[PDB]
Amino acid sequence: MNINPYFLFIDVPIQAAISTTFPYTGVPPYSHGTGTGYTIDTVIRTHEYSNKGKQYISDVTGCTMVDPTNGPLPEDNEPSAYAQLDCVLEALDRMDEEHPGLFQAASQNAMETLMVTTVDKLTQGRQTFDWTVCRNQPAATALNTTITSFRLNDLNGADKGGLIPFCQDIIDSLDRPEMTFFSVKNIKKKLPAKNRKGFLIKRIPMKVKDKITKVEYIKRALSLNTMTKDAERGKLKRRAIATAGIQIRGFVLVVENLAKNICENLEQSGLPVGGNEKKAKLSNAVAKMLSNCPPGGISMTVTGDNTKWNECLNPRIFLAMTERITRDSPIWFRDFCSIAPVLFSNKIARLGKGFMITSKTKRLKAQIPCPDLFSIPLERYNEETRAKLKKLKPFFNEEGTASLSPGMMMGMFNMLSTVLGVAALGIKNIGNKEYLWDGLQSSDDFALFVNAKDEETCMEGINDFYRTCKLLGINMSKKKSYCNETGMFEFTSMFYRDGFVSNFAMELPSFGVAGVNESADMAIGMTIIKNNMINNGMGPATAQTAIQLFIADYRYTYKCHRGDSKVEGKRMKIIKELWENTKGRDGLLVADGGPNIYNLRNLHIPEIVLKYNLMDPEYKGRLLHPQNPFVGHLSIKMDYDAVSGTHSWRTKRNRSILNTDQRNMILEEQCYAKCCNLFEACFNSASYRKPVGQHSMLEAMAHRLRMDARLDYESGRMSKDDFEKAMAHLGEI
Amino acid sequence: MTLAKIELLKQLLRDNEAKTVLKQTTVDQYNIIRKFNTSRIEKNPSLRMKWAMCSNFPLALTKGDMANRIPLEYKGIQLKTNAEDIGTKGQMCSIAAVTWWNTYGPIGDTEGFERVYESFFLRKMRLDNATWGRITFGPVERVRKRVLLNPLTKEMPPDEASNVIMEILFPKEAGIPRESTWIHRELIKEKREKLKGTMITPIVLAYMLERELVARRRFLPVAGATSAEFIEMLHCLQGENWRQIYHPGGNKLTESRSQSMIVACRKIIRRSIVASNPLELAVEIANKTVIDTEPLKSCLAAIDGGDVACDIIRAALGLKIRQRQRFGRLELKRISGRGFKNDEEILIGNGTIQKIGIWDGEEEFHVRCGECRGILKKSKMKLEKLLINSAKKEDMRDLIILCMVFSQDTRMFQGVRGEINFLNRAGQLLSPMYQLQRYFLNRSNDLFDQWGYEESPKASELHGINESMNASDYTLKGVVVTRNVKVSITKNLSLIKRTGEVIMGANDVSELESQAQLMITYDTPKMWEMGTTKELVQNTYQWVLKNLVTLKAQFLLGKEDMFQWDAFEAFESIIPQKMAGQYSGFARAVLKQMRDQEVMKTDQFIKLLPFCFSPPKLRSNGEPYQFLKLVLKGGGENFIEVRKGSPLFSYNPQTEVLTICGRMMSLKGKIEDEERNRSMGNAVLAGFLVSGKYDPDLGDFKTIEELEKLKPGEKANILLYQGKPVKVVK
Amino acid sequence: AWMVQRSLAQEHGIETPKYLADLFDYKTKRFIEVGITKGLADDYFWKKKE
Amino acid sequence: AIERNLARMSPLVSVTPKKLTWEDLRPIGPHIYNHELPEVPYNAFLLMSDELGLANMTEGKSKKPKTLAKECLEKYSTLRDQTDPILIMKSEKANENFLWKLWRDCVNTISNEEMSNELQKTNYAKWATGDGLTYQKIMKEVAIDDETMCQEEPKIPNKCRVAAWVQTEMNLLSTLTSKRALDLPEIGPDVAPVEHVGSERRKYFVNEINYCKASTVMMKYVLFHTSLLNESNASMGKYKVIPITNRVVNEKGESFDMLYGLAVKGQSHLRGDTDVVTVVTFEFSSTDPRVDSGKWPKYTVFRIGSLFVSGREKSVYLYCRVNGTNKIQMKWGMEARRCLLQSMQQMEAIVEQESSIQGYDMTKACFKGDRVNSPKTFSIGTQEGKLVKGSFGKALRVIFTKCLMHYVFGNAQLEGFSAESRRLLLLIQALKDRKGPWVFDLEGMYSGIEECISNNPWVIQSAYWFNEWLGFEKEGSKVLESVDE
RNA sequence: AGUAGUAACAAGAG
RNA sequence: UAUACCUCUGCUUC
């Protein structure tokens, strides 16, 4: 008797048992080595979709530019990037006509937001391309380097605090003939020592001023870094993703804020709608389309998906979109909003590491940097790369980068593109034919409803929608998209079948131990179960099972099995002692080899708070010792409820930096850290609330400490000695 | 400590780097240089942790005495190492070091801990003190709504909350004084007193404060209970296919009762309306309804709120009826006069037409807003008199404005400028009057200017006031500031007074069916009856399938005996009363077709049998109303197709599987032999039979308007479901 | 300035001025507001008193 | 502008829609049936169905792994003492001598009296581990001049055909045993009725999986990877021997420690997450590889004795193989218990949906049947070309097994195949429901799916199963096609 | 060898 | 050339 797990689908329908078609217990595919091939693929294809447009050499950068917009319409189903401005403007006019006031209101909100937005805002951009060192760095560091660099070119917009002067300095820095910036280099110095030879050589780092010419700077300012996307689910082959510089961030923020402020008020945009609310939108949007045409009215649903979404959409359109949307706004704001598209219209793409060539005979390998990419016979590359490199040539730059005028990068203008999709959804009809379409949009993923009298019309409506989208540079995936009679459909891995079904598989990877620490991961671990019980349809048995499995994973990961158990380990050896010593054993946390007291009803309660009354005074005292060394200097995506105890620790820093030339940044860091740690002692609220001021960081401390001294004296805390000493010290400062 | 700070400052300033950093860096830029580090963003912490936990010294300590109290090793086990951490510049250590510290470390001060983390403990007492009830299996309609996740101390906007936190924790650094301080001075005082002696770091106190001040509102699937202290237990309260009665401990709000009470009463009424002798049901149910812990009796008795349904029930059990209304912030009680709403179109001041329900008839209310009290006398679009007391300026003002708007005066309607069709922050369109309220509450100058003035009362006890809420000789037209501060119920739930006049209309309650706040319980058999559309639909069809054995048999014996059955009364309470009869008359006929003639369809019989309860309504001709789909109350989804399947009801003849609101049922072993090639046309229209198949010469698929107008004995084409043409005759 | 003002007011134990004062007298424990008018002083005075 | 453009745009630009009919659904992966290709070989990390665990009764509490394997081998000395290699089958590029030397080194190293589980870095160990096999990095300046150096053509997965060992693995892993392997920890006491219902449900749901085969295999993978990861980081440069351990409880309630084999940990200076550590597996078995040779081309099989298994004597074989893993897969191994939740939730959904219909806990009803209702029955599989009805528990265990196999064979091929085939599934559902589904470029769907079928056993089997099912549905369609009309 | 799969590891660095 | 059967590193990007 041959078992067939598919035969379940004879009994239970596919949506009802959709969880079993997701292999999320398995491993997701990671990348290996270089992504240059994947980047080059994108560069070639992006131009492949627009090569019948207008080619021209940029007199600024000296790069090869291609312009599809207002180009010849396609005569085939190959991904077209040839959008038509007029049609976009009409699609916009329709949206404005049906949503009047939104266009200017959103702009005013975004403007009034911008005006308040400070520079520090840029620090929360995660990985950012640092143009000074030409590497992906933390946003804060990439920003700091850019500010310190700007300071050398007499650009102190940052000192004012606001974003506007900084952005001004950014667009101004383009005019600079030679951009100067710091670069660190080492120096030997004989420090005194008790070392036979009475001295020691420590390489003290020192900063050096380095110059870049206007063009070479502009090229970096316009550059985008690239890397293969790891762990991307539900796909065979890998692909590339990009990272932006510090310059464009401020200009994108505003545009996305605007597009957000717009999208929020649209009813056919699924962004920034929470996954839970997306159903509230979708099911209703369906309910509307259902009861609209009773008499033989065939309501069809189309499970949409777009191809080459990023590689077809052109900045030149987004510029027009900003220009239209900002109609009523003043000029400076239009000029402000217009910049990011202008940059993306003239952007440059970096090609990652390169390609590794080898000899099996000699067992040798070597990476060929993108500059040296062509310093070799093309026959020595493999068959595909040989084809790619030939096609890359016309868009290739001397310094080893690829010019890329058309197309967008993976995840840049999500909002503003979603708007362009909704704009397609806004037409609803063409030529007064007997049908009406509506739908929901989300970047490259869309769901299209079409109501009409007979399906022959519906299909022509869908065809009209397709042919329409072509004019916006939006390309529907004939291969991945499919249509059916309304009642069931799929949208961003959410499955509707006369009501959205659960897809428990999707969230299953989150059940594991998160990797923050013992304290947090518990809270997270229970909270995930608690939430998945509510939203994703997990019964009490399965939930209670997950409660067990998580503790199982938790105790192995953090090596903290039951104190009564006999599992051996360095920690366990002490845990057992703690078990023997402690009286209120049920008061012990699992991290301390305590018993799991959680169940369905108290998932939402922190373990410490649960067990507090069961703890011994010394144990809770030690566990919650106010000045314990394990918890660091805290400072106020999902958040959790947890208590700050000894299990709330932080791990060691990655030490690989120690034996590289970036050692400096440790001293550069700690140099700040000292000043900030002190400034926090002077101003305790600094940790909570962002301090404000364009004045000197020292001045504040001086004044504050002076007042502290004076008041501590006159109140009767400090003695005349301490006051005179304090004032004597401060006097010098 | 100051001396130490200054000394450390001087020691730091020696370092030219630190000096230049302190001199060059700005107070703004502090926010940047703080986040400067060599650290990188961990893209796979789930892995990196599992890896790191297998290393020797994964953790980093803080440099200090408490670190030095930890020994290097302990009974062979290496606790920590000499090597410093790059970030902390303190020693590194193994996780064991934690387990040591917890076992043999220094015992620290934990006084205040409970008050600091009070917010969390309140959950623990809200669970520990709670009491659980019954668990019931059966369908549950979950409505996805934004709700408050946790109960707060006092809800504020983030900006307002942070300032309070700042006032509590860092009073010297609060900066510019806000009004908030004066409003929450008692809260500040309290938290200041409660969090004084503790040793815990302020940054934690601010977090816990912000947790219990700032609100966490999120979209969730909810059914019944929506109060925070219910939401926090939501995972246990319900599923899709089960319900759990839960009674949380601690005190509960009055408004939370007032919220649910209304829904409960409305829901009782909506059911009891359809069944003859409504009062009987209403009383039967209301007697045994429960709001969380309080009976509906105790609630209606104790609370002085209600609206319409509440009074009707109040008069059904026997107690006073507070005819009170709420216009946003304005609270009204009825002194005399019963007005009637009439939908008209008004051309409002700014120059736009608006469909508004104008209230005809004279009316007199006892009025209160915040602290300001008064008496209101109004007529159809006119403030006749407004006799108020003196109070705070904003209350007097808002009282007068809310009265001006509530009165629907033309002087108000013709005092609009710009636009008044703005949505709320979520993006929802407010109602015509509440928009005018939200508008004139802000921009009142137009109203006050457009209103008009007149002579003040010269009676000693009376006074008049002007636009700025100050005494004046020229008062606002119709405004006065004075110094001085049985019933029975019908079978059909209308309240009559001794003089024969009726004051409450059974058909005067709101059809709007909102989610309650607390646990709405019905301590009776057949709870479902007071349920949602789909719940009732499902339970009904289930009850049909459960008794199909007898119900299908009696249909060959008892003529109209089945059509009326206890269970169907509920179902009918779903159906629009304007269609119930038309549906019943059709269903009964289509069924009678399958009875009297030799063409049965069990799947259809089951589908239609519930619709036949309500007394039928045929056309003038004697023929019933033909239908494509039978619509139900609420949600465009909720309808039963006649030819095709539908979101609520569909049938799969391949597996003989009946789908009801998603749930699967098996009809196998309960189907006749000849239902194989038995077309559906013989149970789609009443008094119609399939002759042949689609004959092009007959033309197109004829619609209901045509089919009803066709003469008896006349062929026509009909489309069952997509791709199934049929040739039918009358 | 606000830190100074609030520190002084809080340390001395008095209400914080809602506006930003100019000086503070240590002996009197009183904040001081300085005004530089052109015409009459009496005019500029009672306007501040409001 | 829009319409004026649409007017002048070429007709060739269209969506080319077509209404889907069942005959358009041609069986996916036409090559998997071609015998001209090699049948897909077993490529997992450890053995699953063919596993043979040496059982050692204990107190039921943790001991040191070396001591455990030592005592186990002490119990079963006859196999441990066997120094005489009886080679049955040999992996093409393996080395009998090195492998057997490695096996003996493992056995003896573990069997010895000292604490350390370290192996001497011998030549056979260096071969089996793959010492110094990494290429030497050099300057680009050199490599550019060196004309012999070239970019390597990438290795593309081979095109395998269907193999029955997968089918059998599925048939067996889903079957019941008398041995429970799970290590489920304690939870808080029940108070609310929901918790009692859940707890009462777990007795039915959990045990149904725990008693089955796949559970033990899973726990083996988990517990193994758990330690392998620890050694990989704790002892990077040291070759170490790690036992394939799993504690088990029989129906009587006696804790038997199971030793399925011994594994050699390679050199693990793992920097990047994807960086590989080579692990050499020596696993006991009772399977004669000559029977299904196509299954074991990656393995080297010895014959090291015999045991009284089910009363009768059975020949004990030693399956020797050079394997490899990394931080990612070890972590995902450690997080494999979840294979429960995905299969347990999916069915508890059905128990809840049923309980909704009849208004009480329908668990016992679904599993065993009851006074009112019959037990739940599902179409579980085929038998000489006809359906077969399996119980709820079997339907559960089948899903659990599937979810396990998702991990054990999880890779890009599985991701792509699942993702792309899910669409065709949904279309087939639309057809089953008669919702008149249309397609725009079906060859695209197919081309998208079929490129993911190369040399993944579960993919290649799932394709076959999919075609069989798709076959059986088309017989069902014939019932609907002529309804009414 | 092997892991693995459109490119990598099978240690790297001073 | 050497120190170097030494030293540093395991997400730290060139």
Side-chain angles (χ1 to χ4, degrees), chain A residues 13 30 123 126-127 138 140-141 143-144 147 151 158-159 161 276-277 279 287 294 298 485 513-516 530 534-535 553 557-559 570-571 573-575 577-578 581 592 600-601 604 609-610 612-613 618 621-622 625-627 629-630 636 639-641 643-644 646-647 649-655 666 669-670 672 676-677 680-681 683-686 688-698 705 708 712 726 729 732, chain B residues 2 5-6 9-10 13 22-41 44-46 49-50 53 56-62 66 70 74-75 77 84-89 92 95 97-99 101-110 113-114 117 120-121 123-124 127 142 144 162-163 165-166 170 173 203 206-207 210-211 216 219-221 232-236 628-629 636-637 644 664 722:
Chain A
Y30 280 68
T123 59
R126 295 200 172 187
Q127 296 291 339
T141 63
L143 173 60
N144 185 41
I147 296 168
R151 275 182 168 174
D159 295 38
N276 207 323
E277 183 178 11
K279 290 180 179 181
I298 298 165
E485 186 171 288
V513 178
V516 180
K530 184 243 289 183
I534 296 166
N535 295 320
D553 193 16
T557 290
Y558 288 115
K559 306 185 193 297
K570 293 168 183 181
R571 158 169 264 185
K573 182 161 160 69
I574 305 174
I575 278 181
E577 288 187 5
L578 178 61
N581 298 332
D592 293 317
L600 296 177
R601 71 188 188 279
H604 66 275
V609 179
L610 284 170
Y612 187 81
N613 285 323
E618 57 261 33
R622 292 157 187 163
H625 189 106
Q627 314 100 30
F630 295 90
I636 197 172
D639 57 344
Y640 51 90
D641 294 330
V643 178
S644 183
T646 58
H647 296 292
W649 41 249
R650 59 270 155 80
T651 57
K652 67 174 182 172
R653 186 75 61 78
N654 183 271
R655 317 202 99 236
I666 296 172
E669 173 187 323
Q670 291 175 14
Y672 292 125
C676 299
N677 285 343
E680 283 167 15
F683 297 86
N684 296 22
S685 68
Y688 175 80
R689 186 73 143 281
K690 302 183 198 301
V692 187
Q694 298 75 250
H695 60 275
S696 186
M697 185 173 175
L698 175 57
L705 289 165
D708 287 337
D712 286 17
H729 285 307
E732 296 183 347
Chain B
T2 305
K5 293 184 177 64
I6 296 166
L9 176 58
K10 181 168 179 179
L13 282 161
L22 285 167
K23 285 196 173 185
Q24 293 168 327
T25 308
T26 67
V27 177
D28 295 324
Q29 291 161 358
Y30 156 88
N31 297 316
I32 295 170
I33 57 155
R34 221 284 157 281
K35 295 179 177 179
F36 187 100
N37 58 11
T38 65
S39 176
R40 187 174 175 179
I41 301 162
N44 199 340
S46 58
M49 184 58 61
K50 286 197 201 310
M53 283 299 102
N56 292 312
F57 304 88
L59 312 190
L61 297 166
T62 305
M66 296 302 169
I70 301 170
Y74 178 82
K75 296 178 183 171
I77 305 157
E84 295 188 332
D85 179 50
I86 297 162
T88 70
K89 250 214 161 183
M92 290 187 288
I95 52 179
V98 171
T99 307
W101 173 277
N102 289 347
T103 314
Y104 306 98
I107 301 162
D109 182 34
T110 57
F113 178 78
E114 291 192 340
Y117 291 91
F120 290 138
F121 286 98
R123 304 173 180 179
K124 196 200 177 180
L127 209 174
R142 314 191 74 183
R144 277 157 194 273
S162 65
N163 288 328
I165 293 166
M166 194 62 64
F170 320 95
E173 311 179 46
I203 191 65
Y207 160 73
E210 189 171 320
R211 284 289 293 98
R216 284 180 179 177
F219 272 83
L220 292 170
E232 69 179 25
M233 188 65 75
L234 175 54
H235 53 269
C236 280
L628 301 182
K629 54 173 177 171
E637 332 96 37
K644 183 181 160 175
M664 305 283 189
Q722 184 37 56

Side-chain angles (χ1 to χ4, degrees), chain A residues 63-242:
Chain A
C63 299
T64 306
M65 321 303 281
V66 189
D67 181 21
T69 50
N70 296 336
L73 296 175
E75 301 181 339
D76 58 337
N77 297 309
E78 299 288 359
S80 175
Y82 311 108
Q84 303 295 311
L85 175 58
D86 295 311
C87 304
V88 178
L89 293 170
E90 188 181 356
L92 285 164
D93 282 18
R94 201 104 150 198
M95 209 201 291
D96 184 27
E97 276 182 320
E98 194 161 323
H99 300 272
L102 177 58
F103 269 41
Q104 75 85 31
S107 306
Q108 283 219 56
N109 295 2
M111 185 168 57
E112 288 175 357
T113 303
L114 201 179
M115 288 168 60
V116 178
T117 306
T118 56
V119 174
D120 60 82
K121 170 67 172 192
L122 292 171
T123 59
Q124 67 203 56
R126 295 200 172 187
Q127 296 291 339
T128 312
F129 175 69
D130 196 341
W131 65 271
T132 54
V133 297
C134 294
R135 293 183 294 102
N136 285 18
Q137 296 274 107
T141 63
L143 173 60
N144 185 41
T145 51
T146 302
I147 296 168
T148 53
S149 176
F150 274 26
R151 275 182 168 174
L152 295 177
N153 303 264
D154 204 74
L155 294 169
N156 301 322
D159 295 38
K160 294 184 180 180
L163 179 62
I164 294 165
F166 190 72
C167 286
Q168 181 60 32
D169 285 12
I170 293 169
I171 58 172
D172 286 9
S173 64
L174 298 169
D175 291 312
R176 287 287 195 278
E178 291 184 3
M179 279 294 290
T180 311
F181 72 105
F182 279 133
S183 56
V184 186
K185 301 199 174 192
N186 298 333
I187 291 172
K188 296 184 174 187
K189 290 214 173 180
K190 284 187 179 184
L191 300 177
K194 43 173 177 178
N195 197 65
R196 165 176 176 178
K197 302 185 177 186
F199 59 90
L200 264 173
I201 300 170
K202 288 194 178 180
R203 291 214 173 190
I204 294 167
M206 286 208 68
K207 293 166 185 175
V208 185
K209 297 176 184 179
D210 203 327
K211 298 182 177 184
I212 309 167
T213 175
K214 186 175 175 186
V215 176
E216 291 177 10
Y217 170 80
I218 289 163
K219 280 186 179 182
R220 289 186 193 185
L222 290 165
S223 289
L224 298 172
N225 209 330
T226 58
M227 41 159 50
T228 313
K229 176 162 183 173
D230 291 13
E232 189 183 10
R233 224 100 192 186
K235 282 192 175 180
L236 178 62
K237 302 176 180 172
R238 304 277 58 76
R239 56 166 181 74
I241 53 170

Side-chain angles (χ1 to χ4, degrees), chain A residues 601-634:
Chain A
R601 71 188 188 279
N602 56 350
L603 297 180
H604 66 275
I605 312 187
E607 194 177 30
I608 291 163
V609 179
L610 284 170
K611 298 181 182 181
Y612 187 81
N613 285 323
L614 300 175
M615 294 180 182
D616 303 40
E618 57 261 33
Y619 169 62
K620 72 173 68 169
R622 292 157 187 163
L623 172 61
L624 309 171
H625 189 106
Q627 314 100 30
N628 77 75
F630 295 90
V631 188
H633 296 276
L634 304 173

Side-chain angles (χ1 to χ4, degrees), chain A residues 285-287 289-290 298-302 448-451 483-489 496 498, chain B residues 644 647, chain D residues 435-436:
Chain A
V286 170
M289 296 298 286
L290 284 172
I298 298 165
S299 183
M300 300 198 78
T301 304
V302 184
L448 188 81
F449 311 105
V450 178
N451 292 8
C483 173
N484 55 306
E485 186 171 288
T486 299
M488 32 279 225
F489 66 91
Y496 185 83
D498 301 325
Chain B
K644 183 181 160 175
Chain D
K435 288 285 187 179

Side-chain angles (χ1 to χ4, degrees), chain B residues 44 46-48 50-56 132-135 137-139 236 240-242 244 538 542 601 644 651-654 662-665 676-680 693 720-725, chain D residues 19 191-194 197 201 226 229-230 232-234 236 268 270 273 327-328 330-331 334-335 349 352-361 432 434-435 473 476-477 479-485:
Chain B
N44 199 340
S46 58
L47 168 58
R48 194 72 62 255
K50 286 197 201 310
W51 184 251
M53 283 299 102
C54 295
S55 73
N56 292 312
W132 295 86
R134 279 289 199 78
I135 190 174
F137 300 89
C236 280
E240 205 75 14
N241 296 308
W242 60 272
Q244 172 62 50
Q538 190 174 331
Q542 280 175 197
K601 283 296 199 182
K644 183 181 160 175
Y651 177 59
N652 178 211
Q654 185 179 325
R663 284 69 167 187
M664 305 283 189
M665 284 89 162
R676 186 218 300 180
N677 190 239
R678 219 173 211 169
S679 292
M680 207 60 209
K693 297 185 177 177
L720 295 176
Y721 40 94
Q722 184 37 56
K724 288 299 185 184
Chain D
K19 185 162 186 172
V191 174
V194 184
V197 171
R201 275 176 182 173
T226 304
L229 184 71
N230 189 30
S232 280
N233 197 349
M236 294 198 189
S268 65
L270 308 173
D273 295 328
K327 289 152 76 173
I328 294 161
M330 289 189 283
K331 173 267 200 181
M334 287 179 68
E335 304 185 333
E352 282 190 350
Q353 270 208 344
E354 201 67 41
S355 285
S356 137
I357 293 166
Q358 304 199 10
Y360 66 95
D361 202 343
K432 278 185 70 173
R434 287 179 294 172
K435 288 285 187 179
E473 288 293 345
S477 303
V479 179
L480 292 175
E481 70 180 27
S482 187
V483 175
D484 307 334
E485 187 180 46

Side-chain angles (χ1 to χ4, degrees), chain B residues 285-296:
Chain B
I285 300 166
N287 272 343
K288 296 187 172 185
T289 51
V290 192
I291 290 171
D292 193 16
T293 46
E294 268 211 314
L296 189 57

